[PDB]
Amino acid sequence: MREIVHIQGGQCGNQIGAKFWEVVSDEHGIDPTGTYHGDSDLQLERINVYFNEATGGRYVPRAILMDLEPGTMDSVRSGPYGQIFRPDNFVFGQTGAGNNWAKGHYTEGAELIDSVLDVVRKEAESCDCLQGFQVCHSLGGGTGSGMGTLLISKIREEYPDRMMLTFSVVPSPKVSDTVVEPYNATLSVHQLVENADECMVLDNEALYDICFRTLKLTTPTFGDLNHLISAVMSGITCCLRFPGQLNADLRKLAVNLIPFPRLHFFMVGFTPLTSRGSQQYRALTVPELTQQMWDAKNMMCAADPRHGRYLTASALFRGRMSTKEVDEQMLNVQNKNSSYFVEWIPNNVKSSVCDIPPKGLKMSATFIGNSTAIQEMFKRVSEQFTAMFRRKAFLHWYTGEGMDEMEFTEAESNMNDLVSEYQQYQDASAE
Amino acid sequence: MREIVHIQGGQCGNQIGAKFWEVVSDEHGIDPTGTYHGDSDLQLERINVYFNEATGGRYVPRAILMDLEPGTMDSVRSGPYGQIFRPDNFVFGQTGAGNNWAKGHYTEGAELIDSVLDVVRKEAESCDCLQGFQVCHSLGGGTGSGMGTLLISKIREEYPDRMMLTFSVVPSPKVSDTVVEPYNATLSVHQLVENADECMVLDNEALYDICFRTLKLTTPTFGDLNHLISAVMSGITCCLRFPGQLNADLRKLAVNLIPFPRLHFFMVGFTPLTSRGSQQYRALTVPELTQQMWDAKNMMCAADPRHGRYLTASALFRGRMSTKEVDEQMLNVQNKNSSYFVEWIPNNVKSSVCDIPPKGLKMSATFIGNSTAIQEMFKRVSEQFTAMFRRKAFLHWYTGEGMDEMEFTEAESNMNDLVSEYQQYQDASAE
Amino acid sequence: MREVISIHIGQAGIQVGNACWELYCLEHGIQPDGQMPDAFNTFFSETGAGKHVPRCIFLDLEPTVVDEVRTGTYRQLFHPEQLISGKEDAANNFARGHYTIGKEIVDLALDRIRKLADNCTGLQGFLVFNAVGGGTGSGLGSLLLERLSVDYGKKSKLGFTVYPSPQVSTAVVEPYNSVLSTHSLLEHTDVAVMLDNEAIYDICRRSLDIERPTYTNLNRLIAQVISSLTASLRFDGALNVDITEFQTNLVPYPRIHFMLSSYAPIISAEKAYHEQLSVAEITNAAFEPASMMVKCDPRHGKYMACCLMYRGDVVPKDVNASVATIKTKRTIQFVDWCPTGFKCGINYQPPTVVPGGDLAKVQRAVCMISNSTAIGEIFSRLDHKFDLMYAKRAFVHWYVGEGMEEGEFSEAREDLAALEKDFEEVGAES
Amino acid sequence: MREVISIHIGQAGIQVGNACWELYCLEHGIQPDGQMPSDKTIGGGDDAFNTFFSETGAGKHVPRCIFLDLEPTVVDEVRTGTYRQLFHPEQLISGKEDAANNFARGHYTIGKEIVDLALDRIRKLADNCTGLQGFLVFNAVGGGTGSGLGSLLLERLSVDYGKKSKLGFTVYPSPQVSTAVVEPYNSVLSTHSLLEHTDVAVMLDNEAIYDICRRSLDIERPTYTNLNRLIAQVISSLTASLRFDGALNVDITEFQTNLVPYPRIHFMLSSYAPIISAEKAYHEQLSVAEITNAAFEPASMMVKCDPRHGKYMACCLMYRGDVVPKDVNASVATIKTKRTIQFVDWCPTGFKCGINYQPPTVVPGGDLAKVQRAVCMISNSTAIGEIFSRLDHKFDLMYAKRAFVHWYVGEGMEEGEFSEAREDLAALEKDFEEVGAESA
Amino acid sequence: GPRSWAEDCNQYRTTRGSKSYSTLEDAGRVPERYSRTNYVPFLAERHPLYSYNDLGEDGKGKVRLDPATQADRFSRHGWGDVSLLKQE
């Protein structure tokens, strides 16, 4: 009975959440109408973690979809598995920030942040025993990045003893959607360090590289990318919703992973990704999942984890599995390359086993990793941030809605602090 | 066997009460002709409180209809559920007040008030045991505000041991329906503070916001507004007409909602309101009704309940519900909001349970609120009165009917005395 | 029963009534012969078997315009003995229509007023139709309204007076007759609504895109306002008003009883389809100075009180949201002593269009009657023109010859100046 | 709700807009009488028409447009065309006499009378619209009306409607072909008004569209009617994100915040990638990677400037049709690597990608053939400074001898504010050089 | 082309002039739109189905969805199926 509040913000956040609630639905076996039609009794045992009871057996999600433009919300409402949401939970604005952090956080934020806390407070008070908040958004944008950093800021002041899972996508080196991606991410990262509790860094071309080499998809649309995002997010909550041999809540993963309060940027991956032409050749064994687990190619972050050391890693196995080959292989991967693991945190790898697998898969795993190799991303975003700020290009808006350049000078102050934090943590050694 | 005499005055009183008898006749199961056609024994058990037995099983409403212009009477008679009323109760003038308080109370009223009390005394003598008089009218007009408030003086003189339930529609802040709203409202309130035992303050501006924000009605008529007003009136007399686990009649409410004799103005709100877009997603339960009845948007008065402390409150729950959930939810709203409630009265909330929910809903609640925040609407009308009174404008139409200017000063002094007592009890604290 | 009596004095009075009673017949389905193929009781009286007779009299000294009604398409509609004529007109002389030729013809006028009042059960008020510029309209109208005050008290009399403009003048002695009629209409009439000729000309050429409007085109849309403000008695509605509603909601002071008019959705047939006539669209257009029936600048003055007669498919919600935007608009100024300045009434019948008329069929309509301090500019314009012409005593020997005293010209000017002083003191803030 | 007000000032604006409104009725299904026929195709009461049209009464749609020109001969052309019933008659604002290729006439003497009526219908359309997002101005700065009356309306709109974007599409004089002699005078003085008032300004030129129509549509004789047809496709694909839903919707304020690094440098080029005839379409294999290379060709821009001299500062690529997101990122990767185009050093991420889903339309009888995909490139560069530089040289040559000045001087204009626009334009020449200069 | 001056001036409008612009009747078909939604728009008070339950039963006769293009939109967005990782 540890429920999780879900909030979707931005174009990327709402599109991910639209696919996310499809993956939660068929795991618990509910139809697009809302009534239950699964064939397992264990699905209905824990539905308050993500859904709310309604009249006539209707199951309404704990989702608070919110955006400053109503265009993306129209697509999610009209789509399949989209009529399940409560229309009261679709808090929205009309003017739209339009890829501006200052508009999404200061001007257009003020008229909406009073309304979105009222919807969350109504939902959070109704449910009994809160565990955390699951927010999904982008960082390069302005509609969900600057607004999402505002909503996390107010929800920490209101519920300071509860978790926040922030599944956020980041700017990319290879291909960039918007010109103002370095400006919007640097301001957003400054608010995610002080406020958020766990941060799951996702990256677009890592999703594209997985869809090309592993899944062998010729034309990977955004739905193929968003199904990979929801593969992790279903696996994080798998112990709350389904019984298992090693039960691990959000707070279990939180206290096991972060040794210090600021170093809470993670990187995730889903293990059994095989192309349709290679299903019969592959054997679904425990060492096969682990070999794909620690591969850098399977990692959904742009940062190469060979360049850095894992401070702490988490694995969430699901399915009918033996605890022998689970933890022995975690011992085996630590002994194979001990140089890639932090020495002063002994026994880095933490594992949990859940009895009920995801739908269709015999067994699966979700791999959270708190590695210091993520500094290559924060250095890279700070590199493009200092490239434009010296010439003061694309700046006359942010200083127009009242966010001074002192907020920029403080931006790379903490942006370069946390990339200096991760570097010296890797260099330090015991004794 | 505790009959209520219903009086409707003026254009606003006739139109609202026409929809009041729309609900009650449908609730008690009588047809447009008047013959009983209910499907339950419980409807016949207390049909006498609003209806008199006549020839052929037709039940005529115990309603006296009075105004000065036959156009509103033609609308009531020719409309649906208009053939049940007794034509002997169709007392009306010919000249018309023209929204004048002096013509409704001194010149024209003198030759028809003797007519309206003849039928009222006939209706009072016929029923065995009176329980009160229920009047519905406005305060900005002169046909129903002027003539109706006259009868409150005389019906209190003839029957001093019986109660007055005044559903008065007060003027709006943003819009004025009549140019002489503060003249007529301040004069009628002075006639209501002494004669009326309790008052039920209604207004249209809160009904506009309820239909838009909650019921999602973009184009509501008066029939939509009067339906919500009629839902309150059926809720007040719920324990009179039906058995319950804890009965509470009109004397039960007045002894709990009136701490001091001049503090008898209440604000109302009908709880389970939602649109069909959220009907399926809504989970109607006693916790869900509790968070809806205590919201400021659900209230049917212009006064914001957050600005002033609640002196006393009454809740009239209808439906098969647990009495524990009745008391603990009223307990939990007291402890979660302690600054919003008056400290020197412990247990501010009156709770009553009726076993018969209205037709179509399995659970309902009618909330009565005695709060010091209702001085805000009184202060605005008094401020509008002093702006018009200082230039002596729109006054020669009033003093030309035999009224002196000192009645305006005493009405204004009683208006200022009313808002002084509300402010003092809010500021005063025990010990 | 709601019953109203209308009187039409002069050439302008009965020509407006020709368009007025043409519109009233179509509202209740009355055919021109008087046969209907309970709401009709306000303007028509049932006589005999299936015949409806209008409750009005067409009185005029000039016989050349009364007999046009007696020989027109409405021969069987009006009672011919209700239509009162005379041998010769007043010839634009106020003294003729008040003393010499107006004295014998007003005795027959009060005879049929008593006959009409006894036939009707409950009388609501009086509707006078006259032009203060002409000799017959000002002269006989002053005498008729003077006798109606003493004979019929406590019944409010609506005043629809065709009022002169300095820009467009049809006669030379218009300033004399308008000034002399001002004393009569100040103390006798309860509610006076001004109407100006050239403003109706400008509404036709701007909204109805007619390059050459005629007097027939003016009187049709003048009758649209009159039928709209009386429509609350005839038909059911959401917020019904009466004749006695207007007299106290729009008159703050016993000498301040002058109000303007505005009909908002005046759109031709071709332009009606493209335009979306929302409630907020016409309410914004109603308060536009272009829509006023008198040439006024309401931004010069302040609105003392406003009445809004809404017809058609109008709910209480959008009439509130329309006037909420009106109060927030800066260019619409209300006077400081009246915070509650709006009166709104909603009817349930869309306006009927005359066959061959310029107006298009519209779903909703707004007729607005408002009391403003800007009406003093209209009265002050002919005040100066009268002063220049009276100073050289031109065009006076026609008046003093017909029994008029010379000393009453200054008495009318002082009463006109007393009207000006009352406007500038009510407009002054305190 | 998303909606824009499209205004057309001058002879070039009306003809481009009449081709623009020709294309918009075909996409949304609006017949020339203004009524959408439901029986033509499957489809319900969507809000895609609400961007440019307003449903009035029942089953009637009017454009959110105004047509104004002092010359009566181009506005009565629409009044007797295929779209007489489409427009309400008031927003076809006419006049007595034209501006006669005199900027002083449009700004000062004649255009002052007509601009009061122009702001009234702009005010009425603003009350009809729920949430306004932009103004679309179609004017030509070479003529008297587009430069003169365009300057007055743009100044008044910025006062009445602050901070709302105005996307003004302007046609400049070509270095080679010109249809008037006082074009350098009108274009320079309009640059002052276009600078501090237009939020995002898109350049056009007759000769470059003449060159595109000559080679890409292999027809030797391009008329003005055919030039306006493919300008309308640029306007349609720019606004296509608001009407039809797509993978990456781009708002008007998203165009603004991503393409102009500094407030004064807001002069952008325009490109359309597939511009092909029916016979050449069969031989061509249209793919996202190929059209993106075709979008950045030096001959594909609609302004006759060479981008190799300058550097592409901020680029935006509006896609339409069956464009998957996987290969546009491959298209961005290939267009970034090759050296034949050059980016500015301080903007590492310069592309704005927008993918819509609605396929491009074709009007029957036009030269364009139906294609599955399209790219509408609107990109800022430092090569626009060459366009102002040649225009500056022709104005400075005609100002030394003071030719064609007494026409302006007598019509309200004074001598002093000819050089004021010359000084302001010269400040624009220096800004393109100093912004595009490298930083050490 | 034209054979006389009268024919040229008579056919100026319907060939190269103000009536030469393409008509929807001249077009073979109206393209099938990819709209945001055929349900009620999100912020639009003046809608016939605003108070009604448009997503479900109340709007069944009046929403008028397009199955082929709606399925094409869902397939392009990747919302129709979750079969990418089903493995069986």
Ligand SMILES: Nc1nc2c(ncn2[C@@H]2O[C@H](COP(=O)(O)OP(=O)(O)OP(=O)(O)O)[C@@H](O)[C@H]2O)c(=O)[nH]1
């Ligand atoms: N609105 C309107 N005004 C009219 C019409 N006919 C005349 N008028 C006005 O009336 C003025 C003339 O005054 P009247 O009182 O009608 O003239 P009269 O009734 O013939 O009076 P005598 O000439 O003395 O007989 C003209 O200046 C017009 O402005 C009409 O049909 N409609």
Ligand SMILES: Nc1nc2c(ncn2[C@@H]2O[C@H](COP(=O)(O)OP(=O)(O)OP(=O)(O)O)[C@@H](O)[C@H]2O)c(=O)[nH]1
């Ligand atoms: N692309 C394109 N350009 C046009 C078209 N019509 C006119 N132009 C351009 O407009 C310029 C003429 O200036 P305009 O602003 O149209 O002249 P105007 O609007 O009539 O203003 P006045 O001449 O003063 O009345 C020419 O140099 C053309 O380049 C057209 O249909 N398409």
Ligand SMILES: Nc1nc2c(ncn2[C@@H]2O[C@H](COP(=O)(O)OP(=O)(O)O)[C@@H](O)[C@H]2O)c(=O)[nH]1
């Ligand atoms: N995985 C995924 N990413 C998306 C989707 N839509 C947008 N994005 C990413 O979101 C980033 C841009 O964020 P943006 O839309 O500007 O955020 P917003 O301003 O809050 O709406 C791009 O880098 C895209 O890669 C989607 O459907 N799926």
Ligand SMILES: Nc1nc2c(ncn2[C@@H]2O[C@H](COP(=O)(O)OP(=O)(O)O)[C@@H](O)[C@H]2O)c(=O)[nH]1
């Ligand atoms: N709820 C409701 N209120 C009404 C109705 N008619 C009038 N009112 C209100 O009554 C007040 C004015 O009353 P009025 O009509 O002048 O009373 P009258 O003197 O009898 O004519 C205004 O505040 C209106 O909002 C109605 O049908 N329903």
Ligand SMILES: [Mg+2]
């Ligand atoms: Mg005459």
Ligand SMILES: [Mg+2]
């Ligand atoms: Mg021209």
